[PDB]
Amino acid sequence: SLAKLGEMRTHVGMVKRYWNPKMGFFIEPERKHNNDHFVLELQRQSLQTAYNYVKEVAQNNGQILFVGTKNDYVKKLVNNIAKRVDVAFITQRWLGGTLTNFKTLSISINKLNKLVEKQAENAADLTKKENLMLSREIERLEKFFGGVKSLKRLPNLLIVDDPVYEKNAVAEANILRIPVVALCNTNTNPELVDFIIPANNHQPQSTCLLMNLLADAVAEAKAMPTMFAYKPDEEIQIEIPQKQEAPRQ
């Protein structure tokens, strides 16, 4: 009915001996691999809880948020999710103060929109150098605020691929009372993140799998067809460069 265990050929395993001990409740006693394998049943109920909460939030008529910062593949991935579902996101660095304070960023996004409409209405009546420089800060503002622009208040919920790399983001979310869901690797700290999904974020194929199922789990509540969610088979398998070598130097 939903994401059988057959897909899990390599989505468990992380750098050895680099695991927070308090989260071992999700991990069975170690094998010789030393790459921390998981329990897929608890994985399934975690995804089920995440799905029935994100669907509820989407039908609750709220705004959710997406976070991605790792080098290329997660950034292009969240870009694909955004171009596939009309919803805000972040691609560049988390601004360190994005959510705990919003007036000083709401004014900036409003200035972004004002300059966007200024270009949209001006028929190059300004000087050529003036048009050039105006487009220059337009490019900068699209680069930094491209994702978070279709919102008025702070998001009712947000996701994150790796709370460890987004310690700033998850910390700012925890400061406020808004919940958070994460793709918690073996080095995360479970008590911080509200809803835990023990998935391997080192392998790009696992990342695309998980965020695509999440995207369809929210798009089905958005009335869009769930391409990867509730799909039986022969759709989950996504192209991937050779995905192995879980340990890292």
Binding site: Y53, E56, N60, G62, N156, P179, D194
Partner: peptide, 5 residues
């Protein structure tokens, strides 16, 4: 948190 609202 039980539910959203």
């Amino acid at each position: 948190m039980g539910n959203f609202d």
